[PDB]
Design a protein around this ligand. Structure first.
Ligand SMILES: *[C@@H]1O[C@H](CO)[C@@H](O[C@@H]2O[C@H](CO)[C@@H](O)[C@H](O)[C@H]2NC(C)=O)[C@H](O)[C@H]1NC(C)=O
Lengths: 49, 49
């Protein structure tokens, strides 16, 4: 009357193929907060009485 | 028919006929069912716990 069976093998997950990476050289720039700086010369005369 | 879908060539598998005979045998991707040494019917895997 009562009859059972063994379970058969299963499909195991495939190992994912994986990511591909591009080799490159990179230079990262940011916002400039430094003021523009340039040298100048002042000419004036102090006066007093 | 041997075990696990094997095809045996020598029919030396006999037995004294008995009342109450009732057997399942692995056949194809399923089973075959004989009652009293008479072909009852094939039966796929899903219908056995
Ligand atoms: C990175 O390159 C490999 C090269 O083999 C890709 O391999 C692919 O794998 C997928 C499975 O998702 C197949 O559909 C493609 O036919 C394969 N391509 C080749 C050329 O083999 C891999 O998929 C690539 N990266 C990603 C994220 O898929």
């Amino acid at each position: 009357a009562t009859v059972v069976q063994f379970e058969q093998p299963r499909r195991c997950p495939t190992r994912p193929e994986g990511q591909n990476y591009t080799e490159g050289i990179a230079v990262v720039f940011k916002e400039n907060i430094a003021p523009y700086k340039f040298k100048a010369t002042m000419y004036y005369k102090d006066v007093t009485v | 028919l041997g075990e696990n879908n094997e095809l045996r060539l020598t029919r030396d598998a006999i037995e004294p006929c008995t009342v109450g005979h009732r057997r399942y045998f692995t056949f194809g991707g399923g089973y075959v069912y004989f009652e009293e040494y008479a072909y009852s019917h094939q039966l796929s895997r899903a219908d056995i716990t």
